[PDB]
Amino acid sequence: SATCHDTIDDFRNQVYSTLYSMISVVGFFGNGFVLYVLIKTYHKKSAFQVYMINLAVADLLCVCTLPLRVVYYVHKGIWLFGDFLCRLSTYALYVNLYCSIFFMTAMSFFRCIAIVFPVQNINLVTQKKARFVCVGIWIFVILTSSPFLMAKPQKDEKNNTKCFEPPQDNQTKNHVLVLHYVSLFVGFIIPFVIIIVCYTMIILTLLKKSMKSADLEDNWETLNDNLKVIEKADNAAQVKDALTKMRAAALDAQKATPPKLEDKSPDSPEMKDFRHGFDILVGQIDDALKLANEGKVKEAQAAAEQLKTTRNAYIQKYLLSSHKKAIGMIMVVTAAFLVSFMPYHIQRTIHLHFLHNETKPCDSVLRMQKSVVITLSLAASNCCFDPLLYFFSGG
Ligand SMILES: O=C(Nc1cccc2c(=O)cc(-c3nnn[nH]3)oc12)c1ccc(OCCCCc2ccccc2)cc1
Ligand SMILES: CCCCCCCC/C=C\CCCCCCCC(=O)OC[C@H](O)CO
Ligand code: NA
């Protein structure tokens, strides 16, 4: 099988060396810039900022171990470093991968509560709660990825020191299969379901809030448009027609919530004054109608300008960015889950089932060894997804 192994080795060494090199550069210069900004911007403390520091740290710790993988594949697949470094480099990539998944999961759940429940949400109170979730993730990942720090050393047919190889003996094949099933369910399927559930709730909340904001702008546009009709009208019939259209628009806008009061309680003084503003405006429309019905067409135009002062002193101060930053967070994490994490966990499942099988011909082994090169490189590319999270989300 010496000819069979060397065939895939040509692809394996070329692709891994080229991809890990750019992933090391883009990862270091990307996350390094992200961490530099977050440290300088200490005055503005957010739950999103807590997850961004932790994501960059987990990436920097991984990109520092990635050039050791470059040296390995450049040197025709021979490990020039120590046995501990082979164990630590393999450990670092898994730690980073599952830290990234759990941090992006917790970030999605914390943003979901901030969007669905904006009244009970407190920016600095959730920040302290996010710090406890981060250490809870770190302690879990470090202790669960520990069997790889005490793993058996990998050797070739000519006793050559090898690294990042599939399990050799049947005992190691069993020890990693037990870890695979746990890390597939707890470390991928469940956090993926959480992201699918969280994002369904977020888009639904935003789709409703944007629609209600569109109706509020439509009612305020007609209120200003019909006010221009009254001053331009010559007869009372045109004035009375616009006032009935204005009264209907003023009642609709009174029920709807403005974007500046999304974080405020429906019984708060801010929401009570907004409703009271339209209560005076409706009364002023009816007072103008009472004069328009009397035949006083000119005198009704003065009352239409009298309610314009009420609009400026009660409804103007109430009539955002949170929607844009949430949408950006959805895209980046979804792209990271479909490109980085999903092909890795899919291929790994197919790979371990193949290794346990008795019949394994050269052509079939060639596909599995080529597929893992692609998926593991994409799994390692998760460090390139996090700098984009800063640029497209949470300010
Ligand atoms: O079977 C595995 N890998 C594998 C199979 C077949 C072939 C190969 C292969 O050719 C090359 C590599 C390789 N991995 N890195 N570099 N090269 O790996 C292979 C494998 C199993 C488990 C695992 O991590 C589980 C612990 C994570 C912590 C965790 C625990 C509980 C909940 C959540 C999180 C990781 C890899
Ligand atoms: C936030 C996440 C909380 C969710 C927590 C839920 C607990 C997960 C329970 C079971 C997962 C299934 C993994 C079972 C792995 C058993 C290993 C095994 O023995 O199976 C291999 C078999 O022996 C060889 O064919
Ligand atoms: Na990451």
Side-chain angles (χ1 to χ4, degrees), residues 2 4-5 7-9 11-13 15-39 41 45-48 50-75 77-79 81-110 112-119 121 123-124 126-127 130-157 159-161 163-172 174-177 179-207 209-211 214-216 218-220 222-224 226-227 229-231 233-239 241-259 261-271 273-289 291-296 299-305 307 309-314 316-318 320-357 361-368 370-390 392-395:
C4 188
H5 279 78
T7 305
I8 334 148
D9 271 320
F11 176 85
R12 194 197 292 181
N13 294 330
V15 179
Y16 272 138
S17 299
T18 314
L19 284 165
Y20 286 154
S21 287
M22 47 190 75
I23 283 157
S24 290
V25 175
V26 176
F28 177 78
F29 287 92
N31 292 282
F33 177 76
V34 164
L35 214 138
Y36 173 77
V37 173
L38 289 154
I39 293 300
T41 324
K45 281 156 95 278
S46 181
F48 178 86
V50 173
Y51 294 121
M52 283 305 297
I53 288 156
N54 281 278
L55 277 158
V57 161
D59 290 334
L60 284 150
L61 257 94
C62 186
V63 300
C64 282
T65 59
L66 282 164
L68 307 164
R69 301 184 168 247
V70 184
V71 178
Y72 175 81
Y73 295 100
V74 161
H75 282 250
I78 319 293
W79 190 251
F81 314 94
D83 285 291
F84 168 75
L85 286 150
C86 178
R87 280 177 283 179
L88 195 76
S89 301
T90 314
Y91 176 77
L93 191 119
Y94 302 149
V95 163
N96 162 257
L97 187 101
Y98 292 99
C99 272
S100 299
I101 291 157
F102 295 139
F103 288 143
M104 280 179 170
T105 300
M107 185 199 265
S108 293
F109 190 88
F110 268 65
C112 177
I113 302 304
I115 294 300
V116 177
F117 309 89
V119 185
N121 188 80
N123 303 100
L124 70 106
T126 53
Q127 195 267 355
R131 288 214 155 268
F132 275 95
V133 176
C134 284
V135 291
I137 285 155
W138 275 113
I139 297 304
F140 178 80
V141 174
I142 285 161
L143 294 163
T144 52
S145 307
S146 68
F148 287 95
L149 281 171
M150 45 184 154
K152 289 161 96 177
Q154 293 130 82
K155 292 273 182 179
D156 194 63
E157 294 175 300
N159 281 314
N160 287 94
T161 304
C163 206
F164 329 109
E165 278 278 316
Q168 309 288 279
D169 59 295
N170 293 277
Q171 195 183 62
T172 307
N174 165 49
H175 274 77
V176 302
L177 192 73
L179 275 155
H180 159 76
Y181 290 130
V182 179
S183 61
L184 180 79
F185 182 77
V186 177
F188 180 75
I189 291 160
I190 290 303
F192 186 60
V193 172
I194 292 154
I195 265 124
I196 303 301
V197 167
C198 283
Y199 290 170
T200 299
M201 298 302 166
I202 298 153
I203 67 108
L204 270 157
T205 306
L206 298 174
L207 272 158
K209 283 185 183 183
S210 187
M211 198 206 84
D215 291 309
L216 194 131
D218 264 43
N219 292 307
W220 206 70
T222 56
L223 262 152
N224 283 299
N226 292 299
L227 219 147
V229 176
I230 295 157
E231 59 184 89
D234 296 278
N235 60 317
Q238 277 173 50
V239 178
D241 191 85
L243 280 157
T244 52
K245 282 179 178 177
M246 270 177 76
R247 203 190 179 269
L251 289 160
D252 269 285
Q254 190 185 57
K255 285 178 244 184
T257 306
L261 303 184
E262 292 296 324
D263 291 85
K264 298 283 173 183
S265 180
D267 273 68
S268 64
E270 292 81 16
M271 283 279 279
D273 189 70
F274 173 78
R275 281 182 179 92
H276 184 77
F278 284 92
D279 268 298
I280 306 300
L281 200 89
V282 159
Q284 280 172 281
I285 284 157
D286 293 313
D287 281 315
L289 273 150
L291 292 154
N293 286 315
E294 281 181 300
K296 297 167 175 176
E299 289 172 71
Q301 295 168 318
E305 209 72 35
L307 54 95
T309 314
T310 307
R311 186 199 71 208
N312 306 323
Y314 298 94
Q316 198 179 277
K317 56 185 186 284
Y318 303 110
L320 285 155
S321 60
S322 301
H323 295 50
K324 198 106 175 286
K325 274 82 172 279
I327 286 297
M329 197 205 68
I330 293 153
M331 290 190 198
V332 179
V333 173
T334 305
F337 260 80
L338 289 155
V339 178
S340 274
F341 318 125
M342 206 189 76
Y344 167 81
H345 287 92
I346 283 170
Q347 200 274 335
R348 206 178 67 183
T349 297
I350 310 153
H351 209 112
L352 281 139
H353 180 80
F354 184 85
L355 292 164
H356 281 74
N357 196 45
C362 180
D363 56 271
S364 297
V365 176
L366 192 124
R367 288 196 297 272
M368 307 306 286
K370 273 177 177 177
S371 298
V372 65
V373 173
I374 298 143
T375 61
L376 198 83
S377 292
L378 293 161
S381 85
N382 81 90
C383 69
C384 304
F385 283 92
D386 288 305
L388 271 92
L389 237 168
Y390 154 82
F392 294 110
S393 183

